[PDB]
Amino acid sequence: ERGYSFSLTTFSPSGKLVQIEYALAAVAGGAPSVGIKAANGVVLATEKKQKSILYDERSVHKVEPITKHIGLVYSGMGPDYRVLVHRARKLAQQYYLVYQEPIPTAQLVQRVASVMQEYTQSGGVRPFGVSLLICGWNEGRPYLFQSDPSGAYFAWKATAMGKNYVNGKTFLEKRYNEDLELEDAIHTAILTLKESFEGQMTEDNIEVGICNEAGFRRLTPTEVKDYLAAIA
Amino acid sequence: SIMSYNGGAVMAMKGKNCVAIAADRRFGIQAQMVTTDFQKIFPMGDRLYIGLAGLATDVQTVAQRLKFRLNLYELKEGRQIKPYTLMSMVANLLYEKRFGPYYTEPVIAGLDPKTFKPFICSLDLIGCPMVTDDFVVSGTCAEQMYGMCESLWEPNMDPDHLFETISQAMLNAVDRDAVSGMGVIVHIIEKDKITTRTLKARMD
Amino acid sequence: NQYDNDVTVWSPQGRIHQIEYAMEAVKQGSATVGLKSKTHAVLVALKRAQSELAAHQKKILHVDNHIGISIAGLTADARLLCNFMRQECLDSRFVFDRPLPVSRLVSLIGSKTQIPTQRYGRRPYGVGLLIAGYDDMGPHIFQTCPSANYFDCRAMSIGARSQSARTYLERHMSEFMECNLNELVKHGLRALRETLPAEQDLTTKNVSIGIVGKDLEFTIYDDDDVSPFLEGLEERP
Amino acid sequence: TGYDLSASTFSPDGRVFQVEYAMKAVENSSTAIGIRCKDGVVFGVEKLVLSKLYEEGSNKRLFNVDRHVGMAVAGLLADARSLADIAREEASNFRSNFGYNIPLKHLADRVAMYVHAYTLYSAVRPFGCSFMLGSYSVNDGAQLYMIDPSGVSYGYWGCAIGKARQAAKTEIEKLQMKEMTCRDIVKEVAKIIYIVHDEVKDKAFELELSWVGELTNGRHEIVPKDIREEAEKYAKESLKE
Amino acid sequence: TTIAGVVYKDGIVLGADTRATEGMVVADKNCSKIHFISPNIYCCGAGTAADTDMTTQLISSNLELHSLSTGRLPRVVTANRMLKQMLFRYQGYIGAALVLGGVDVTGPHLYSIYPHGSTDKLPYVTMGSGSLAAMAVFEDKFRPDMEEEEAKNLVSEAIAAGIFNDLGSGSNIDLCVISKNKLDFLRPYTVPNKKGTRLGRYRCEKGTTAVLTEKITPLEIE
Amino acid sequence: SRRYDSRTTIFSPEGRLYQVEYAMEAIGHAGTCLGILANDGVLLAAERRNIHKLLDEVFFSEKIYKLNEDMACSVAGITSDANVLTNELRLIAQRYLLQYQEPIPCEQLVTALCDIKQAYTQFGGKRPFGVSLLYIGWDKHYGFQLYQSDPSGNYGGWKATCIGNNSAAAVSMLKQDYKEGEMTLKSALALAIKVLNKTMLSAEKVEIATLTRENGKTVIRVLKQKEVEQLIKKHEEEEAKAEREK
Amino acid sequence: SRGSSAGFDRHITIFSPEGRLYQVEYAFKAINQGGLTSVAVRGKDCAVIVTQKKVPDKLLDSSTVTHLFKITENIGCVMTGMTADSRSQVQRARYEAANWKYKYGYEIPVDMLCKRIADISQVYTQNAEMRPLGCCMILIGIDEEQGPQVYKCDPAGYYCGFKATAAGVKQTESTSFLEKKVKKKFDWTFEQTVETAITCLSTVLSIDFKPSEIEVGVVTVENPKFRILTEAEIDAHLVALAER
Amino acid sequence: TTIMAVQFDGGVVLGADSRTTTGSYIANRVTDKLTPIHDRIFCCRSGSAADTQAVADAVTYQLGFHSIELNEPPLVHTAASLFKEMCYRYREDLMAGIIIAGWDPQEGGQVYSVPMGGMMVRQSFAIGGSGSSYIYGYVDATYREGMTKEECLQFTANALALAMERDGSSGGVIRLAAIAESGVERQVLLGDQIPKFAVATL
Structure with missing residues (x-):
């Protein structure tokens, strides 16, 4: 077969693209994620609860590096997220090949959001069922972005995604501070996750990445263990 | 030989906190002069210029396509391009025609949009970039320009001294080349101003 | 119903309704009979006139010196298939300098007409064919169907009311092999007449004949050229 | 209820109803049986004759797909001929690329994957035929495989496809085919085909026999006419008593 | 151009001269010919400079994608395979001759890669117009499992042979030392040549150049 | 497959294109954008909807996009669709400049984009773009210009217009407040502030861009928070005096 | 809502009002149609896959009825669910691994192969014209760095590494049993891992296996090549299990 | 280059010199021209290094995939057929003379020549490369049926040594590989281990 040529996302009489709203419902049912932009870096944190102890929790990561200076996390559907991660890494490399310079965070976010938009209008596909938090560092500045299933993106100082993200946003409003x-910021992000967390949090229950001048990196379980011991 | 068809010469030079870019003015076809005011240096930013020597049609085409790409880049990114990024963009453009190459060898000269640090570079016709700290040259009279620059260039020149050095280099180099000359135009790029001058030059 | 609009939809009974509807297309057409002896293959086609002032629609077509066909069903599909068959025979003569054997032509028709029965948006060919041919194995009558199945027949009849012709052919087939050409054509004509209603009768206007044989290239007889074959025919019951 | 219109749609129970419907098409066909013995493979088919107008041998359901590989079919005959063309192309291409006779297991896998490709899309419909592939080689022995509309391929010692597959399987299970020759197996195949044939519903039928084994030097061919006459005499004698 | 590489006890040493010419005229006195591929893999390039630059940039970006997806350090064999298959695809029209060297999970590895896509795995390699002189140095002096300082001196002597005996090679000597526990990009490692002192002063004083027209455009600053 | 096809580009029994009407319904709820043409410039004023306290500002503006040296636009409707269309607009402008070595006249840019939109309404089976655009520009043929386009691919030039939320009330206000041929940039900004106040203001909730000519060059400028605060305060005291007088 | 539906969300892979993909769930249900169960257990220096073997017809050639496949000399897999879907997926995995070795010069790691297959599956979940495959793949192999590796991918495009896992009808009970076993301890020897896998299968099915009712495949750090055990070895393991 | 392969009862012996030249410059003096295509199937390459490397890699990939699919050890004839198909299809673009030698359980030890142009022939023994011209006579005079593996190794070593002495494009060390059911045994003759024949004096 060849793919269907007609769009599966169309306007409703009220003016809504309901498939986008349904993909957003899928996002809102995802595992909670948090981003906080600090003065000197960005922290991405996400709940990483496994269904059972049989899962090798250290085999699949939710916090992924796109480039030395760009990382991302998601809420929603994992396989869709893997697709978008692969596309984002490809886009960043293409930018680097043309300009011989690491892609700015805003440019990477715009390109990935363009792909996500394409999946709301092309024939025979559904939108991605994920929302992304993209963190980056360039021009001596940290950047935190969110990109939605519709392909719309926003710049945030702090935000929460996934299950219970409205309470998370209120909590971040109360706690956040630009200075x-x-x-x-890492302490605040872990505290935000704690608000909507079921059971005790361990270094194996959550995943954390940080972006700063040195670059983006996923934190190790030992570092997360230290931060959790401090949090208590 | 294809790049000697129209003649021409451009040169760029680095001073203390300034750059200079100069070019001959002749547009001719082989031995015949057609005009004496042909543009070979094109602005790419407030403090960033590209000089193009070689085949005149390719000079014009490359300048126009580069402006296309630069305009789109600056709209999409919302910022002025840095000299090194412009060099990479030009290299990519030229290499895209690796087996059908444009017959021009650009030089770039500018200041960093945020730091105002001097930058110069040169590219071969298929886009190999060469960044230098003193001077670059391109065109039919490259050997003459190399002699003049190797002899006259000094580090940390102030704008007036840079002007005199690049002017003497260009004038004396083109005076020994049959198909380059008919005037010289010089742009001195500083933090606060761009000074453009045309020199008193032999018209034979 | 929901199973009877596309060729790619199996019904819960294991049938494909669109193919059966194309079969109906064939069953609507005017009767045609094919039969053979040890040396000859004969097609006899009853032609319809849409109006008393219109010519009767041609039912027998040339394919190659050794192959002719009789069509029943949509005539445009018939022309498509006939053109394909003609091209196949031309290709055989061009490449191998020999006539295309009839059975291989029928196999090619089968593949061609089976392809659309499995693809979305395509339809079956709405024509049945009787193919009369002569090759190194002797004379041949083949029947091809919209279902892309084909049959090798001692004799066959297709089209409206062709069951009567099939009854006659079943009754008399024992005699076909040892028949001379004239007796063979007369048997074909009697079989075809069995399809006619009482009011109608075989004439030189509504009958066409096609004959191929060892020393006889495929020849189509129409109008007065049919009178010699009709002359010896008795009166129907 | 709307879930059974396209092969690209799972029912809420995880079934693909279009494939099951194609299998029903297979089930409404006259039976064919393959039997693997020590020396080779024998195929028998109960070709129903739908009118005396047809020449003997019309609508054959046994095909040569390669010198060493025979194929017996049940279901939509046109689909079966299409699959036979596919199998022939696969064997010819394999010989062209690798320079030797395609192993039967590999050919069966390739054709089964071709069949499977038609079970995934709304653009096409599943094939409406099941078929057996039989081969015999010195290096590989005797091999018998069966493929169904879903694309599932399995090797067998005895296989029956068609409307009387279960009764034919019950009869086949009574033979110790692993220590028999093709010469006795042809008689047993004729007997089984005659047993399972429904004399009232199905009217008349022709017995189609083919085989491939040591006695044919690895070439698949129709059973010689005298052998078939003996086998049919034995089958009728077994029926009458 | 002279580029060379050797395998020593604990890693690789790559070396290059820093001259780039157009015809018989020096264009660049300080050309960098040792190209980053990955943190543990480097590549010296001879032949067509644009071809070398573009090919190594492309393979570096592809290897970066591969390492991001695998989450493992790239292997030198992967770089060699990608390079050679690309070059063979272009049937020698990409004029890139390369010395690829790295340390991966399986130890140190050194390849020479030729423009048509042929490769050789060797304990020492030379390439460029000065390749023969450097190879003479290696054949005369190379020993297996040299210590790091011996390998550095050997590669430096080879590049120096190329510099002083081939008109296409000159200027500085750049080295790159790769081991499992470090990478030392030494640019320049040695400066055997230097411009002589300028005896006279030819300083063009202000007013020496006659000017027909002048235009000063003030630039607005932040 | 016929069963699942939405049939986006077909007529309805009354001669309507339902997807286009629904896209316009979508635009009706988006943030308000208004354009006003004056003798010495043209302005766009857009209501910001991204007003959450934790949002960061990194860009030139939220809803106003520069298209080329002489042209900018504002978008109401689906944001990602708007990004697609702004990229296409920039590409069209640059293609024109490459071919002719002059800036594209404003109406030619608008027509080129509306052709793409109309194409999406006539064939291809895709949903239309759910975007309406206001364009402001300057060219040598007609001077200062303000255009509007909608998902159907229709477009028109205006002296003052409004798209998005409460566009009808804003249009009524402009009809009763715009002085044809007698508008300056200053009075235009005052009118924009008044109209946005009615169809809703505070400085952080609106972005304003002006387009003027200075020394034969086009200047596109987004008013900073200081200027917008001053405009809002000027409107507030003007309204206070008007109320007191009565 | 709960189990709400709009438009065609039950027939093609478009989001339901809840954000679910019903066709993917139906493919998961199709996995159980085969009626079989497989278990995989990761030891200290070995990985083992056990699976039910069913041959209801004595006319079937039992050698040809298997769910264990070599993907590469060092990578083996057990497939659960619709057989033809499983065979197509095995063909794709073999192609991916051979292409990987051809392009990169070293053998594909198990995790990377599982990721590639899962990405293909994910594509099936976003394009409406084809259905997802109704099968689940469990891969085992020895990675030179990580040691033994057990990975699983499913029709949703989701994959993961595991200490132990199961697929098929008795997946949940198998996982409960294995969860208890790994909680008590995890550092198993080769014999211990094989016996744990066999006991999981036997307990969930409540059968005591004859050698011919199950299939076993193993990789070990000593012999990383994927090996399928013979009825002799299986009977040795079964007797060593019964005696204890 | 000089490459050679010889069949013996139960296996094959392959041999090659180790010289790779560009013009008269020896770019590689320890080249390895015996390439494993599969467990018990080798190819000796002569001609353009890039072409033979690319073709051998492609054949290795195809044959490994084929062997995995069939679950059986590949036939030497199958590897030779794959090589032949590639060398014939691209004979206008390739410069590659191949010798495919190996062992399989069906036909024992086999040697096939796939010379430039893409024909394929089985032979009791095969020689190739630029240097083979100088040893035709020698091999024709020295070969005999029923040679054991040891005798075949000595025969190959002698033939390659003579070719290397005369052919400017050959030299270095001699790489030998014996392939049988038990496996592949590789060795390198260098220096004084290479057979010597005195240069005539006076």
């Missing part, structure tokens, strides 16, 4: 440093 706080990166370690305080």
Whole structure:
């Protein structure tokens, strides 16, 4: 077969693209994720609860590096996220090949959001069922972006996604402060996750990445263990 | 030989906190002069210029396509391009025609949009970039320009001294080349201003 | 119903209704009979006139010196298939300098007409064919169907009311092999007449004949050229 | 209820109803049986004759797909001929690329994957035929495979496809085919085909026999006429008593 | 151009001269010919400079994607395979001759890659117009499992042979030392040549050049 | 497959294109954008909907996009569709400049984009773009210009117009407040502030861009928070005096 | 809502009002149609896959009826669900691994092969014109760095590494049994891992296996090549299990 | 280059010199021209290094995939057929003379020549490369049926040594590989291990 040529996302009489709203419902049912932009870096945190202890929790990561200076996390459907991660890495490399410079975070976000938009209008496909938090560092500045299934993107100082993200956003509003440093941001992000977390959090229950001048990196379970011991 | 068809010469030179870019003015076909005001240096930013020597049609085509790409880049990114990024963009453009190449060898000269640090570079016709700290040259009279620049260039020149150095280099180099000359235009790029001058030059 | 609009939809009974509807297309057409002896293959086609002032629609076509066909069903599909068959025979003569054997032509028709029965948006060919041919194995009568199945027949009849012709052919087939050409054509004509209603009768206007044989290239007889074959025919019961 | 119109749609129970409907098409066909013995493979088919107008041998359901590989079919005959063309192309291409006779297991896998490709899309419909492939070689022995509309391929010692597959299987299970020759197996195949044939519903039928084994030097061919006459005499004698 | 590489006890040493010419005129006195591929893999390039630059950039980006997806350090064999298959695809029309060297999970590896897509795995390699002189140095002096300093001196002597005996090679000597526990990009490692002192002063004083027209465009600053 | 096809590009029994009407319904709820043409410039004023306290500002503006040296636009409707269309607009402008070595006249840019939109309404089986655009520009043929386009591919030039939420009330206000041929940039900004106040203001909730000519060059400028705050305060005291007088 | 539906969301892979993909769930249900169950257990220096073997007809050639496949000399897999879907997926995995070796010069890691197959599946879940495959793949192999590796991919495009896992009808009970076993301890020897896998299958089915009712495939750090056990070895394991 | 392969009862012996030249410059003096295509199937390459490397890699991939699919050890004839198809299809673009030698359970040890142009022939023994011209006579005089593996190794070593002495494009070390049911045994003759024949004096 060849793919269907007609769009599966169309306007409703009320003016809504209901498939986009349904993909957003899928996103809202995902595992909670949090991003905080500090003065000197960005922290991405996400709940990483496995169904059972049989799962090798250290085999699949939710916090992924796109480039030395760009990482991302998601809420929603994992396989869709893998697709978008692969596309984002390809786009960043293409930018680097043309301009011989690491792609700016905003440019990467715009290109990925363009792909996501394409999946709301092309024939015979559904939208991606994920929302992305993209963190980056360039021009001596940290960047935190969110990109939605519709292909719309926003710049955030702090935000929460996934299950219970409205309470998370209220909590971040109360706690967030532009002047706080990166370690305080990590503490605040873990606290935000704790609000909507079921059971005890361990270094194997959550995943954390940080972006700063040195670059983006996923934190190790030992570092997360130290931060959790401090949080208690 | 294809790049000697129209003649021409461009040169760029680095000063202390300034750059200079100069070019001959002749547009001719082989031995015949057609005009004496042909543009070979094109602005690419407030403090960033590209000079193009070689085949005149390719000079014009490359300048126009580069402006196309640069305009789109600056709209999409919302910022002025840095000299090194422009060099990479030009290299990509030229290499795209690796087996059908444009017959021009650009030089770039500018200041960093945020730091105002001097930058110069040159590219061969298929886009190999060469960044230098003193001077670059392109065109039919490259050997003459190399002699003049190797002899006259000094580090950390102030704008007036840079002007005199690049002017003397260009004038004396083109005076020994039959198909380059008919005037010289010089742009001195500084933090606060761009000074454009045309020199008193032999018209034979 | 929901199973009877596309060729790619199996019904819960294991049938494909669109193919059966194309079969109906064939069953609507005017009767045609094919039969053979040890040396000859004969097609006799009853031609219809849409109006008393219109010529009767041609039912027998040339394919190659050794192959002719009689069509029943949609005539445009018949022309498509006839053109394909003609091209196949031309290709055989061009490449191998020999006539295309009849059975291989029928196999090619089968593949061609089976392809659309499995693809979305395509339809079956709405024509049945009787193919009379002569090759190194002797004379041949083949029947091809919209279902893309084909049959090798001692004799066959297709089209409206062709069951009567098939009854006659079943009754008399024992005699076909040892028949001379004239007796063979007369048997074909009697079989075809069995399809006619009482009011109608075989004439030189509504009958066409096609004959192929060892020393006889496929020849189509129409109008007065049919009178010699009709002359010896008795009166129907 | 709307779930059974396209092969690209799972029912809420995880079934693909279009494939099951194609299998029903197979089930409404006259039976064919293959039997693997020590020396080779024998195929028998109960070709129903739908009118005396047809020449003997019309609508054959046994095909040569390669010198060493025979194929017996049940279901939509046109689909079966299409699959036979596919199998022939696969064997010819394999010989062209690798320079030797395609192993039967590999050919069966390739054709089964071709069949499977038609079970995934709304653009096409599943094939409406099941078929057996039989081969015999010195290096590989005797091999008998069966493929169904879903694309499932399995090797067998005895296989029956068609409307009387279960009764034919019950009869086949009574033979110790692993220590028999093709010469006795042809008689047993004729007997089974005659047993399972429904004399009232199905009217008349021709017995189609083919085989491939040591006695044919690895070439698949129709059973010689005298052998078939003996086998049919034995089958009728077994029926009458 | 002279580029060379050797395998020593614990890693690789790559070396290059820093001259780039157009015809018989020096264009670049400080050309960098040792190209980053990955943190553990480097590539010296001779032949057509644009071809070398573009090919190594492309393979570096592809290897970066591969390493991001696998989450493992890239292997030198992967770089060699990608390079050679691309070059063979272009049937020698990409004029890139390369010395690829790295340390991966399976130890140190050194390849020479030729424009038509042929490769050789060897303990020492030379390429460029000065390749024969450097190879003479290696054949005379190379020993297996040299210590790091011996390998550095050997590669430096080879590049120096190329510099002083081939008109296409000159200027500085750049080295790249790769081991499992470090990477030392030494640019320049040695400066055997230097421009002589300028005896006279030819300083063009202000007003020496006659000017027909002048235009000063003030630029607005932030 | 016929069963699942939405049939986006077909007529309805009354001669209507339902997808286009639904896209216009979508635009009706988007953020308000208004354009006003004056003798010495043209302005766009857009209501910001991204007003959450934790949002960061990194860009030139939220809803106003520069298209080329002489042209900018504002978009109401689906944001990602708008990004697609703004990229296409920039490409069209640059293609024209490459071919002719002059800036594209504004109406030619608008027509080129509306052709794409109309194509999406006539064939291909895709949903239309759910975007309406206001364009402001300057060229040498007609001077300062303000255009509007909608998902159907229709477009028109205006002296003042409004798209998005409460566009009808804003249009009524402009009809009763715009002085044809007697508008300056200053009075135009005052009118924009008044109209946005009615169809809704505070500085952080609106972005305003002006397009003017200075020394034979086009200047496109987004008013900073200081200027917008001053405009809002000027409107507030004007309204206070008007109320007191009565 | 709960189990709500709009438009065609039950027939093609478009989101339901809840954000679900019903066709993917139906493919998961199709996995159980085969009626079989497989288990995989990761030891200290070995990985083992056991699976039910059913041959209801004595006319079937039992050698040809298997769910264990070599993907590469060092990578083996057990497939669960619709047989033809499984065979197509095995063909694709073999192609991916051979292409990987051809392009990169080293053998594909198990995790990377599983990721590639899962990406193909994900594509099936976003394009409406084809259905997802109704099968689940469990791969085992020895990675030179990580040691033994057990990975699973499913029709949703979701994959993961596991200490132990199961697929098929008795997946949930198998996972409960294995969860208890791994909680008590995980550092198993080769014999211990094989016996744990066999006991999981026997307990969930409640059968005591004859050698011919199950299939076993193993990779070990000593012999990383994927090996399918013979009825002799299986009977040795079954007797060593019964005696204890 | 000089490459050679010889069949013996139960296996094959392959041999090659180790010289790779560009013009008169020896780019590689320890080249390995015996390439494993599969467990018990080797190819000796002569001609353009890039072409033979690419073709051998492609054949290795195809044959490994084929062997996995069939679940059986590949036939030497199958590898030779794959090589032949590639060399014939691209004979206008390739410069590659191949010798495919191996062992399989069906036909024992086999040697096939696939010379430039893409024909394929089985032979009791095969020689190739630029240097083979200088040893035709020698091999024709020295070969005999029923040679054991040891005798075949000595025969190949002698033939390659003579070719290397005369052919400017051959030299270095001699790489030998014996392939049988038990496996592949590789060895390198260098320096004084290479057979010597005195240069006539006076």
